[PDB]
Write a protein that binds this ligand. Structure first.
Ligand code: HEM
Ligand code: HEM
Ligand SMILES: Cc1cc(N)nc2cc(-c3ccc(CN)cc3)ccc12
Ligand SMILES: Cc1cc(N)nc2cc(-c3ccc(CN)cc3)ccc12
Ligand SMILES: C[C@H](O)[C@H](O)[C@H]1CNc2nc(N)[nH]c(=O)c2N1
Ligand SMILES: C[C@H](O)[C@H](O)[C@H]1CNc2nc(N)[nH]c(=O)c2N1
Ligand SMILES: [Zn+2]
Lengths: 411, 409
């Protein structure tokens, strides 16, 4: 079976055959679409078919399918599974797996860059202190004095689910959030629950609006431990506006390195529960969502006030006007400080080129429209008019439950 | 299988049971989601269960499920179908069916108004001249001197596919589009082929930027006919900006009445191929899409120029800045001229409330996130953070082929 997608701005029609290689499920059925739903101990029984499928893909990509090297590897992995109940990936396989997990990430608009991923092998790690060291080196490498470089650090795979490696932070660098007695929130409302866990684990909180959170790191199923990232490793950018001199007086800043640390990397049935990865920001992530979401810093009001906008009726679009200015400031600040950032126009344009390239050389590109279209100015970016097919390929990044909900405490 | 939807800005959770009523299909499977795809002659057999399903929901809605009246009507339609190979809706059923087709339109953000629909029964129409008359009356009623009122006009149902009633226009009111020898396009580019069909069918084009297109009306399957809508029925709004005086110099205006005329209304298995319906605009439909789409009026660059913005790099967000000002102007203009319009903030907020209402009194609300979220400022509107379930309920509005691709001329 063949499937078609149309760009309605350009009438370009592309043909998807890659969706045939899809195994996992979407959540949708013939009678319902769950396209906008945010989120819709493995045995040797089901593991070798997963391993075989991966190795078949791996050896196809290196043009050695059916070779002796391929057949021996399959033999080797098989024996290791019946004997040890799991198996170990070779370095080459790990690197391939991590890159393709990104390549397959249907919600990621930045995938033109997928083949340029620095992979750090941390599978020899054994303790939280070792985790801290590996993560510090990731941050230094990735940050590169403002010239950001994509990277991922991969900690040991799950075994019996009782000895998981986890990074308890949702991102390596994030600001604290504090609920005040009067109901107000200081800092980042998104991080209030995590901030509280940290504080309980012994963190002494500065209680400011932009405090970098400590790392809470769990090795081999043990209780997590607290570590402070050296401040010299945490690159930050003061937010100012190119025409509005009062904007700096809002006292806003943000960190340069987006590094998500709570997802799970699946490769050939193996599960890597600690695998922090990082790239660079698209401006709207900070300027639209981080700053202007009602449930975050929510600075629309103060910015609209200082612009002296008609905030009485919404049909004055004061909200819309402030939003643009805030996003102008974020991009201006990052560029002025020579910290890698990309605007949503550039990024979406790149994605369309990526996607077309992928349809031609790969037979498709799974893509989640709901997530790919930017949170402002949707239809003046070229992905808005682009039809997309969403399906799940492996290797993949998956969601996993927050560890504090599942962890068995040692004491 | 009793599904939940969460709002991530408020933690409000709603439970959907209405989806289990759904009949038709979405285009998705467990292995693929087609949620962003734009577009994914009935026998005696298929007709009677369809009629039964409809009459069942109708008599439940008036709390007379399992009544003599119910069973009698059921038997009456049953006999008429066996006999005539089709059937006719009672007036009350027709009004119910039309209101619920709107109610079920998962892509429509304006559905909080769904039960205040004025239904004009035009099933006695026989000619294009008659169609023109019914359509002029619709337009005048809907427009109401700027105080817009929702309305639908329903022409005779399909019979054998050879006697279809069709409005060939996509909307009752739309501006012409002409391609220049120079290369570009004057007027509305989306309407370039239709503007040509009209001329190709006999229209005399003034070749302006805002020429109201003629109606092309097809009755009983005959060749369609051109009719000019009386200009005093076409309410238009001159577009000016509340702070930029040079804005008027652009020479922009739009029409007040959005009236879509190329869809198909399905009730109880019956197919109404001509059923123009109208409401009032959400501001972004004109200012974001109509004015700023690249394959439309595409005036973004011209506007930014006049604002002296830095158009050298995309990261100046000059497009975004212009986009907002244009949309401020559209709203300002309509509001100034007392022509009904709604901004995307109030409309999306209205929709969340409608959702709340539907989950409470009905058990759910089919909704297509990809279309409900406005084309600008998405995440600062409350629908962005609202999970939605999309499924197809009947009665419904459906797409149908363009007539010129079908009509045996
Ligand atoms: C290099 C520049 C990159 C840019 C500009 C970028 C941009 C984005 C954006 C804007 C999102 C939506 C997230 C949100 O709105 O909160 C996203 C999602 C995502 N990104 Fe990328 N990204 C980049 C690199 C990477 C890398 C290096 C990886 C992994 C190695 C990655 C993996 C993902 C995944 C898995 C998602 C989906 C998250 C989910 O399913 O919820 N990205 N990206
Ligand atoms: C009264 C004010 C109304 C408002 C503000 C409104 C708003 C909207 C908007 C913004 C769209 C998206 C269309 C686009 O982006 O091109 C839409 C779609 C739609 N509207 Fe409404 N609408 C209104 C009334 C109505 C009425 C009266 C009907 C029918 C009786 C209707 C039926 C539909 C349908 C069927 C679609 C989508 C068709 C599809 O592709 O499935 N609307 N509406
Ligand atoms: C590597 C990378 C770069 C970037 N600019 N944004 C990301 C954003 C995410 C991301 C962030 C948040 C969420 C859920 N709110 C889902 C995915 C993950 C990775 C990213
Ligand atoms: C009645 C009404 C009012 C309004 N403001 N917009 C509409 C927009 C539509 C519409 C327009 C186009 C399409 C297909 N692109 C689907 C639906 C239909 C009816 C509308
Ligand atoms: C390809 C994509 O589905 C297409 O551009 C859709 C997306 N969302 C939309 N949403 C609305 N409201 N109206 C539209 O015309 C579209 N177009
Ligand atoms: C409910 C809805 O799916 C949710 O708000 C999504 C919508 N699209 C998104 N798109 C991106 N890029 N990031 C997000 O966090 C979200 N949130
Ligand atoms: Zn779907």
């Amino acid at each position: 079976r063949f499937l078609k997608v149309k760009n309605w701005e350009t009438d370009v029609v592309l043909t998807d055959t890659l969706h045939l290689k899809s195994t996992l499920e979407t959540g949708c059925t013939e009678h319902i679409c769950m396209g906008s739903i945010m989120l819709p101990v493995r045995t040797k029984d089901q593991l070798f078919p997963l391993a075989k499928e991966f190795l078949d893909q791996y050896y196809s990509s290196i043009k050695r399918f059916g070779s002796k090297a391929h057949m021996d590897r399959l033999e080797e992995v098989n024996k290791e599974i019946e004997s040890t109940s799991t198996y170990q990936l070779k370095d080459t396989e790990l690197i391939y797996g991590a890159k393709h997990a990104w390549r397959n990430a249907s919600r990621c608009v930045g995938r033109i860059q997928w083949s340029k991923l620095q992979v750090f092998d941390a599978r020899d790690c054994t303790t939280a202190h070792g985790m801290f060291n590996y993560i510090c080196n990731h941050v230094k490498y990735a940050t590169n004095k403002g010239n950001l470089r994509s990277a991922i650090t991969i900690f040991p795979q799950r075994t019996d689910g009782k000895h998981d490696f986890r990074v308890w932070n949702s991102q390596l660098i994030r600001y604290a959030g504090y609920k005040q007695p009067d109901g107000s929130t200081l800092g980042d409302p998104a991080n209030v629950q995590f901030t509280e866990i940290c504080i309980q684990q012994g963190w002494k909180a500065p209680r400011g609006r932009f405090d970098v959170l400590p790392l809470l790191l769990q090795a081999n199923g043990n209780d997590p431990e607290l570590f402070q990232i050296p401040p010299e490793l945490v690159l930050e950018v003061p937010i100012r506006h190119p025409k509005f001199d009062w904007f700096k007086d809002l006292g806003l800043k943000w960190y340069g390195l987006p590094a998500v640390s709570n997802m799970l990397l699946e490769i050939g049935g193996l599960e890597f529960s600690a695998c922090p990865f990082s790239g660079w920001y698209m401006g709207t992530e900070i300027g639209v969502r981080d700053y202007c979401d009602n449930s975050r810093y929510n600075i629309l009001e103060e910015v609209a006030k200082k612009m002296d906008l008609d905030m009485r009726k919404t049909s004055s679009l004061w909200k819309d006007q402030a939003l643009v200015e805030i996003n102008i400031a974020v991009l201006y600040s990052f560029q002025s400080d020579k910290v890698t950032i990309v605007d949503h126009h550039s990024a979406t344009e790149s994605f369309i080129k990526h996607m077309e390239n992928e349809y031609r050389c790969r037979g498709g590109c799974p893509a989640d429209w709901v997530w790919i279209v930017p949170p402002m100015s949707g239809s003046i970016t070229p992905v808005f008019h682009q039809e997309m097919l969403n399906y799940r390929l492996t290797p993949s990044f998956e969601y996993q439950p927050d560890p504090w909900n599942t962890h068995v405490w040692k004491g």
